[PDB]
Amino acid sequence: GPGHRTLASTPALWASIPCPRSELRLDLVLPSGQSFRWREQSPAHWSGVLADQVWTLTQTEEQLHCTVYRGDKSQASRPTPDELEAVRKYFQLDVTLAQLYHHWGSVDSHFQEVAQKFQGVRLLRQDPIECLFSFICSSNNNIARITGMVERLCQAFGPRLIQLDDVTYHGFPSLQALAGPEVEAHLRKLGLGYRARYVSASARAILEEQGGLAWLQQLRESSYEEAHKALCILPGVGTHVADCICLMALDKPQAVPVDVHMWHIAQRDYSWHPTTSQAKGPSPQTNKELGNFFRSLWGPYAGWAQAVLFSADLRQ
DNA sequence: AGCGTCCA
DNA sequence: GGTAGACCTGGACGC
DNA sequence: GTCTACC
Ligand SMILES: [Mg+2]
Ligand SMILES: [Mg+2]
Protein backbone atom coordinates (compact mmCIF):
# COMPACT_ATOMS: atom_id res chain seq x y z
CA GLY A 1 0.00 0.00 0.00
CA PRO A 2 0.91 3.72 -0.07
CA GLY A 3 3.93 4.67 2.00
CA HIS A 4 4.07 5.81 5.58
CA ARG A 5 4.68 9.57 5.39
CA THR A 6 7.52 11.66 6.74
CA LEU A 7 7.16 15.35 7.55
CA ALA A 8 10.17 16.53 5.56
CA SER A 9 9.13 14.56 2.48
CA THR A 10 5.39 15.33 2.31
CA PRO A 11 5.02 18.71 4.04
CA ALA A 12 1.75 19.56 2.25
CA LEU A 13 0.04 16.68 4.05
CA TRP A 14 0.91 17.73 7.63
CA ALA A 15 -0.41 20.25 10.12
CA SER A 16 0.96 21.28 13.49
CA ILE A 17 -0.29 21.63 17.04
CA PRO A 18 1.56 23.96 19.47
CA CYS A 19 3.42 21.54 21.69
CA PRO A 20 6.96 21.98 23.01
CA ARG A 21 9.11 18.94 23.84
CA SER A 22 8.78 19.87 27.53
CA GLU A 23 5.08 19.00 27.21
CA LEU A 24 5.45 15.78 25.23
CA ARG A 25 8.07 13.26 24.12
CA LEU A 26 6.44 10.78 21.71
CA ASP A 27 9.35 8.35 22.13
CA LEU A 28 8.88 8.28 25.89
CA VAL A 29 5.04 7.97 25.79
CA LEU A 30 3.91 5.87 22.82
CA PRO A 31 6.01 2.71 23.35
CA SER A 32 5.90 2.78 27.17
CA GLY A 33 2.89 0.58 27.88
CA GLN A 34 -0.01 3.08 27.89
CA SER A 35 -1.23 2.42 24.33
CA PHE A 36 0.02 -0.73 22.61
CA ARG A 37 -0.89 0.41 19.10
CA TRP A 38 1.85 2.83 17.99
CA ARG A 39 4.91 1.92 15.88
CA GLU A 40 7.91 4.01 14.82
CA GLN A 41 7.68 3.00 11.15
CA SER A 42 10.15 5.78 10.14
CA PRO A 43 12.78 7.30 12.42
CA ALA A 44 11.02 9.73 14.78
CA HIS A 45 7.63 9.12 13.11
CA TRP A 46 4.95 7.21 15.02
CA SER A 47 1.99 5.61 13.26
CA GLY A 48 -1.18 4.18 14.78
CA VAL A 49 -4.98 4.32 14.95
CA LEU A 50 -6.50 7.38 16.61
CA ALA A 51 -10.29 7.82 16.43
CA ASP A 52 -11.03 5.23 13.69
CA GLN A 53 -8.26 6.58 11.40
CA VAL A 54 -4.53 5.97 10.91
CA TRP A 55 -2.26 8.88 11.84
CA THR A 56 1.47 9.52 11.74
CA LEU A 57 2.93 11.85 14.39
CA THR A 58 6.32 13.49 14.64
CA GLN A 59 7.74 16.37 16.63
CA THR A 60 9.86 19.40 16.18
CA GLU A 61 11.10 21.45 19.11
CA GLU A 62 7.88 23.45 19.55
CA GLN A 63 5.23 21.60 17.54
CA LEU A 64 3.53 18.23 17.25
CA HIS A 65 3.14 17.53 13.51
CA CYS A 66 0.28 15.30 12.38
CA THR A 67 -0.89 13.62 9.18
CA VAL A 68 -4.00 11.49 8.65
CA TYR A 69 -4.74 8.71 6.16
CA ARG A 70 -8.48 8.80 5.73
CA GLY A 71 -8.82 5.71 3.54
CA ASP A 72 -12.24 6.60 2.14
CA LYS A 73 -10.80 6.99 -1.38
CA SER A 74 -10.60 10.75 -0.88
CA GLN A 75 -7.78 13.00 -2.06
CA ALA A 76 -4.81 13.40 0.25
CA SER A 77 -4.79 16.58 2.32
CA ARG A 78 -3.48 17.85 5.63
CA PRO A 79 -5.54 17.26 8.79
CA THR A 80 -8.32 19.79 9.40
CA PRO A 81 -8.62 21.77 12.64
CA ASP A 82 -11.50 19.52 13.71
CA GLU A 83 -9.39 16.43 13.02
CA LEU A 84 -6.45 17.89 14.97
CA GLU A 85 -8.70 18.40 17.99
CA ALA A 86 -8.90 14.63 18.35
CA VAL A 87 -5.09 14.50 18.60
CA ARG A 88 -5.12 17.36 21.09
CA LYS A 89 -7.64 15.51 23.23
CA TYR A 90 -5.79 12.18 22.99
CA PHE A 91 -2.65 13.82 24.45
CA GLN A 92 -4.73 15.89 26.94
CA LEU A 93 -2.77 18.96 25.92
CA ASP A 94 -4.96 21.27 28.04
CA VAL A 95 -3.00 19.89 31.03
CA THR A 96 0.31 21.70 31.47
CA LEU A 97 2.87 19.01 32.27
CA ALA A 98 5.74 21.33 33.23
CA GLN A 99 3.80 22.57 36.24
CA LEU A 100 3.01 19.03 37.39
CA TYR A 101 6.69 18.09 37.03
CA HIS A 102 7.63 21.08 39.16
CA HIS A 103 5.18 20.08 41.91
CA TRP A 104 6.17 16.40 41.88
CA GLY A 105 9.85 17.32 41.93
CA SER A 106 9.29 19.75 44.79
CA VAL A 107 7.78 17.07 47.04
CA ASP A 108 10.02 14.22 45.88
CA SER A 109 13.72 14.73 45.11
CA HIS A 110 13.96 11.25 43.59
CA PHE A 111 11.23 12.15 41.12
CA GLN A 112 13.08 15.40 40.37
CA GLU A 113 16.23 13.50 39.41
CA VAL A 114 14.40 11.03 37.18
CA ALA A 115 12.31 13.81 35.63
CA GLN A 116 15.43 15.71 34.55
CA LYS A 117 16.16 12.87 32.11
CA PHE A 118 12.56 11.88 31.24
CA GLN A 119 10.84 15.10 30.11
CA GLY A 120 7.44 15.17 28.47
CA VAL A 121 5.98 11.90 29.74
CA ARG A 122 2.29 12.64 29.78
CA LEU A 123 -0.83 10.53 29.96
CA LEU A 124 -2.86 9.58 26.92
CA ARG A 125 -6.66 9.77 27.15
CA GLN A 126 -7.71 6.46 25.61
CA ASP A 127 -10.92 4.91 24.40
CA PRO A 128 -12.40 2.94 27.33
CA ILE A 129 -13.05 -0.25 25.35
CA GLU A 130 -9.55 -0.33 23.82
CA CYS A 131 -8.03 0.49 27.20
CA LEU A 132 -10.06 -2.15 29.09
CA PHE A 133 -9.19 -5.03 26.81
CA SER A 134 -5.53 -4.02 26.34
CA PHE A 135 -4.95 -3.97 30.06
CA ILE A 136 -6.83 -7.21 30.59
CA CYS A 137 -4.16 -8.57 28.23
CA SER A 138 -1.35 -6.90 30.20
CA SER A 139 -1.54 -8.82 33.51
CA ASN A 140 1.41 -11.03 34.48
CA ASN A 141 2.96 -10.30 31.09
CA ASN A 142 5.56 -8.13 29.31
CA ILE A 143 4.98 -5.17 27.04
CA ALA A 144 6.53 -6.80 23.93
CA ARG A 145 4.21 -9.78 24.26
CA ILE A 146 1.15 -7.66 25.18
CA THR A 147 1.78 -5.56 22.08
CA GLY A 148 1.63 -8.62 19.83
CA MET A 149 -1.52 -9.97 21.59
CA VAL A 150 -3.30 -6.66 21.05
CA GLU A 151 -2.16 -6.55 17.43
CA ARG A 152 -3.40 -10.06 16.66
CA LEU A 153 -6.67 -9.42 18.54
CA CYS A 154 -7.29 -6.38 16.36
CA GLN A 155 -6.21 -8.18 13.17
CA ALA A 156 -8.68 -10.98 13.81
CA PHE A 157 -11.68 -9.14 15.27
CA GLY A 158 -11.40 -5.47 14.32
CA PRO A 159 -12.40 -3.81 11.05
CA ARG A 160 -9.80 -3.47 8.33
CA LEU A 161 -8.88 0.18 7.88
CA ILE A 162 -6.10 0.72 5.27
CA GLN A 163 -2.77 -0.70 4.21
CA LEU A 164 0.37 1.42 4.43
CA ASP A 165 3.41 -0.28 2.93
CA ASP A 166 3.31 -3.86 4.35
CA VAL A 167 1.16 -2.95 7.40
CA THR A 168 -2.62 -3.48 7.38
CA TYR A 169 -4.26 -1.34 10.06
CA HIS A 170 -7.35 -2.49 11.95
CA GLY A 171 -9.72 -0.73 14.29
CA PHE A 172 -10.12 -2.03 17.83
CA PRO A 173 -12.86 -4.72 18.03
CA SER A 174 -16.35 -3.97 19.27
CA LEU A 175 -17.82 -5.58 22.38
CA GLN A 176 -20.04 -7.68 20.13
CA ALA A 177 -17.07 -8.97 18.14
CA LEU A 178 -15.42 -10.24 21.36
CA ALA A 179 -18.48 -11.78 23.07
CA GLY A 180 -19.41 -14.92 21.06
CA PRO A 181 -18.86 -18.41 22.64
CA GLU A 182 -16.29 -19.16 19.87
CA VAL A 183 -14.08 -16.15 20.62
CA GLU A 184 -12.22 -17.67 23.57
CA ALA A 185 -10.85 -20.61 21.60
CA HIS A 186 -9.88 -18.26 18.78
CA LEU A 187 -8.05 -15.95 21.19
CA ARG A 188 -6.22 -19.03 22.55
CA LYS A 189 -4.93 -19.86 19.08
CA LEU A 190 -3.77 -16.24 18.90
CA GLY A 191 -1.62 -16.85 21.99
CA LEU A 192 -3.46 -14.86 24.63
CA GLY A 193 -3.16 -17.75 27.11
CA TYR A 194 -5.54 -17.77 30.04
CA ARG A 195 -6.51 -14.15 29.31
CA ALA A 196 -8.43 -15.44 26.28
CA ARG A 197 -11.30 -16.32 28.61
CA TYR A 198 -11.00 -13.00 30.44
CA VAL A 199 -11.44 -10.97 27.25
CA SER A 200 -14.44 -12.86 25.95
CA ALA A 201 -16.06 -13.17 29.38
CA SER A 202 -15.60 -9.44 30.05
CA ALA A 203 -17.14 -8.48 26.71
CA ARG A 204 -20.12 -10.73 27.52
CA ALA A 205 -20.45 -9.31 31.02
CA ILE A 206 -20.59 -5.74 29.79
CA LEU A 207 -23.20 -6.53 27.10
CA GLU A 208 -25.31 -8.95 29.16
CA GLU A 209 -24.95 -7.67 32.71
CA GLN A 210 -23.90 -4.01 32.81
CA GLY A 211 -26.14 -2.36 30.20
CA GLY A 212 -23.74 -2.33 27.29
CA LEU A 213 -21.36 0.33 26.05
CA ALA A 214 -22.99 3.12 28.12
CA TRP A 215 -21.59 1.56 31.28
CA LEU A 216 -18.11 2.88 30.44
CA GLN A 217 -19.41 6.43 30.06
CA GLN A 218 -21.21 5.97 33.38
CA LEU A 219 -17.87 5.06 34.97
CA ARG A 220 -16.15 8.05 33.32
CA GLU A 221 -18.73 10.24 35.07
CA SER A 222 -18.45 8.35 38.37
CA SER A 223 -16.00 8.94 41.17
CA TYR A 224 -12.60 7.20 41.15
CA GLU A 225 -13.72 4.96 44.02
CA GLU A 226 -16.99 4.01 42.26
CA ALA A 227 -15.36 3.37 38.87
CA HIS A 228 -12.51 1.36 40.34
CA LYS A 229 -14.85 -0.89 42.30
CA ALA A 230 -17.21 -1.43 39.38
CA LEU A 231 -14.47 -2.51 36.97
CA CYS A 232 -13.31 -5.26 39.33
CA ILE A 233 -16.51 -7.21 38.58
CA LEU A 234 -14.98 -8.10 35.20
CA PRO A 235 -13.03 -11.37 34.78
CA GLY A 236 -9.33 -10.55 34.47
CA VAL A 237 -9.72 -7.10 36.05
CA GLY A 238 -8.26 -6.80 39.53
CA THR A 239 -7.29 -3.71 41.46
CA HIS A 240 -4.25 -2.96 39.25
CA VAL A 241 -5.94 -3.39 35.85
CA ALA A 242 -8.88 -1.36 37.17
CA ASP A 243 -6.46 1.40 38.19
CA CYS A 244 -4.87 1.31 34.73
CA ILE A 245 -8.27 1.82 33.13
CA CYS A 246 -9.33 4.52 35.63
CA LEU A 247 -6.14 6.52 35.05
CA MET A 248 -5.80 6.08 31.29
CA ALA A 249 -9.38 6.01 30.03
CA LEU A 250 -11.84 7.08 32.79
CA ASP A 251 -10.24 10.47 33.67
CA LYS A 252 -9.15 9.53 37.23
CA PRO A 253 -5.73 11.24 37.53
CA GLN A 254 -5.22 10.02 41.12
CA ALA A 255 -5.48 6.32 40.14
CA VAL A 256 -2.07 4.66 40.68
CA PRO A 257 -1.43 1.34 38.97
CA VAL A 258 0.75 -0.93 41.12
CA ASP A 259 2.51 -3.60 39.03
CA VAL A 260 5.89 -5.30 39.45
CA HIS A 261 7.63 -2.07 38.39
CA MET A 262 5.89 0.24 40.85
CA TRP A 263 6.49 -2.27 43.66
CA HIS A 264 10.22 -2.46 42.84
CA ILE A 265 10.32 1.33 42.57
CA ALA A 266 8.73 1.74 45.96
CA GLN A 267 11.18 -0.66 47.62
CA ARG A 268 14.32 0.39 45.76
CA ASP A 269 13.84 4.12 45.20
CA TYR A 270 11.77 5.01 48.26
CA SER A 271 12.83 2.29 50.76
CA TRP A 272 9.09 1.89 51.35
CA HIS A 273 7.54 -0.89 53.39
CA PRO A 274 3.86 -1.32 54.28
CA THR A 275 2.81 -0.24 57.77
CA THR A 276 -0.76 -1.59 57.65
CA SER A 277 0.40 -5.22 57.35
CA GLN A 278 3.02 -7.16 59.31
CA ALA A 279 3.83 -9.23 56.22
CA LYS A 280 5.50 -6.91 53.73
CA GLY A 281 5.22 -8.74 50.39
CA PRO A 282 2.69 -7.91 47.68
CA SER A 283 -0.88 -8.61 48.78
CA PRO A 284 -4.28 -6.96 48.38
CA GLN A 285 -3.68 -4.96 51.57
CA THR A 286 -0.08 -3.95 50.75
CA ASN A 287 -0.81 -3.12 47.11
CA LYS A 288 -3.69 -0.93 48.31
CA GLU A 289 -1.44 0.84 50.83
CA LEU A 290 1.19 1.48 48.15
CA GLY A 291 -1.29 3.24 45.89
CA ASN A 292 -2.34 5.36 48.85
CA PHE A 293 1.31 6.10 49.62
CA PHE A 294 1.91 7.44 46.11
CA ARG A 295 -1.25 9.57 46.23
CA SER A 296 -0.18 11.03 49.57
CA LEU A 297 3.25 11.79 48.17
CA TRP A 298 2.40 13.20 44.74
CA GLY A 299 -1.12 14.60 45.09
CA PRO A 300 -4.21 14.59 42.86
CA TYR A 301 -2.36 13.71 39.67
CA ALA A 302 -0.37 10.90 41.31
CA GLY A 303 -1.21 8.50 38.47
CA TRP A 304 0.46 10.89 36.01
CA ALA A 305 3.57 10.95 38.16
CA GLN A 306 3.45 7.14 38.18
CA ALA A 307 3.51 7.24 34.39
CA VAL A 308 6.77 9.21 34.41
CA LEU A 309 8.53 6.79 36.76
CA PHE A 310 7.07 3.77 34.97
CA SER A 311 8.28 4.96 31.59
CA ALA A 312 11.73 5.64 33.09
CA ASP A 313 11.93 2.24 34.78
CA LEU A 314 11.30 0.46 31.47
CA ARG A 315 14.72 1.90 30.46
CA GLN A 316 16.72 0.48 33.39
C1' DA B 1 24.67 -25.89 22.55
C1' DG B 2 20.65 -25.32 23.80
C1' DC B 3 17.68 -26.81 27.85
C1' DG B 4 15.35 -25.09 31.55
C1' DT B 5 14.56 -21.48 34.96
C1' DC B 6 13.32 -16.68 35.70
C1' DC B 7 10.46 -13.22 34.73
C1' DA B 8 7.03 -9.70 32.82
C1' DG C 1 -10.26 -10.68 55.09
C1' DG C 2 -5.20 -12.98 54.80
C1' DT C 3 -2.40 -16.32 52.58
C1' DA C 4 -0.37 -19.39 49.05
C1' DG C 5 0.33 -21.08 44.74
C1' DA C 6 -1.05 -21.94 39.91
C1' DC C 7 -1.05 -19.90 35.67
C1' DC C 8 -0.35 -19.02 29.00
C1' DT C 9 3.58 -17.32 26.63
C1' DG C 10 8.08 -16.53 25.03
C1' DG C 11 12.60 -13.56 25.45
C1' DA C 12 16.83 -13.30 28.37
C1' DC C 13 20.41 -15.89 29.53
C1' DG C 14 23.11 -19.10 33.22
C1' DC C 15 24.84 -23.34 33.15
C1' DG D 1 -1.55 -9.60 38.19
C1' DT D 2 -5.66 -12.27 38.86
C1' DC D 3 -7.94 -16.26 40.22
C1' DT D 4 -9.11 -19.99 43.23
C1' DA D 5 -8.88 -22.57 47.50
C1' DC D 6 -8.24 -22.92 52.19
C1' DC D 7 -7.99 -21.03 57.00
MG1 LIG E 1 10.65 15.10 12.66
MG1 LIG F 1 -12.35 -9.07 38.39
Domain ranges for chain A:
1-89, 128-249
The residue type of A174 is: S
CA A298 distance to own-chain centroid: 20
- Compute the half-sphere exposure of residue A273: CA atoms within 13 Å on the CB side of its CA: 6
Q: What angle do CA A215, A217, A223 make, to 5 degrees?
A: 95
* Contact criterion met (CB below 8 Å) for A14 and A107: no
Q: Are A46 and A90 in contact (CB under 8 A)?
A: no
Ligand 2 center to A233 CA (angstroms): 5
Distance linking the first and last C-alpha atoms of chain A: 37
Strand D-proximal protein residues, Cβ less than 7 Å: A 138-141, 198, 232, 234-242, 259-260
User: With a 7 Å cutoff on the CB, does A267 touch strand B?
Assistant: no
Q: Does domain A128-249 have CATH number 1.10.357.10?
A: no
Helical H segments across chain A, by residue range: 26-29, 81-90, 97-107, 109-117, 128-138, 143-157, 175-179, 183-189, 195-209, 214-221, 224-231, 239-249, 260-270, 284-298, 302-313
Q: Under DSSP, is residue A193 helix (H, G, I), strand (E, B) or coil?
A: coil
Alpha-carbon span A124 to A65, nearest angstrom? 17
State the amino acid at position A76 in one-letter form: A
**Domain covering A1-89: architecture:** 2-Layer Sandwich (3.30)
Compute, in angstroms, the gap from residue A179 CA to the centroid of ligand 2: 17
DSSP track, A136-147? HHHTTS-HHHHH
Q: Which nucleotide is nearest to A285 (CA to C1')?
A: C2
- Method of determination used here: X-ray
* Cβ of A314 less than 7 A from strand B: no
Taking alpha carbons only, the member of A150, A144, A154 closest to residue A177 is A154
CA A110 to chain centre: 24
Nucleotides of C under 7 A from a protein CB: 1-4, 7-11
Compute the distance between CA of residue A191 and CA of residue A199 in angstroms, rounded to an integer.
13
- Give the CA diameter of chain A: 65
Residue (of A93, A86, A91, A111) closest to A101 by Cα position = A111
* Distance, Å, A66 CA → B5 C1': 45
In terms of Cβ atoms closer than 10 Å to its own Cβ (0-12, 13-18, 19+), residue A197 is: middle
Report the DSSP beta bridge partners of residue A170: A160
Q: How many helices (H) and strands (E) does chain A have?
A: 15, 7
- A148-153 contact pairs (CB < 8 A, 24+): A148/A191, A149/A190, A149/A191, A149/A192, A149/A195, A150/A36, A150/A37, A151/A36, A151/A37, A152/A190, A152/A191, A153/A187, A153/A190, A153/A192, A153/A199
Cα(A284)–Cα(A242) distance, integer angstroms: 13
Q: CA–C1' distance A6–D3 (Å)? A: 46
CB atoms within 10 A of CB A247: 27
* Nearest-ligand number for the alpha carbon of A205: 2
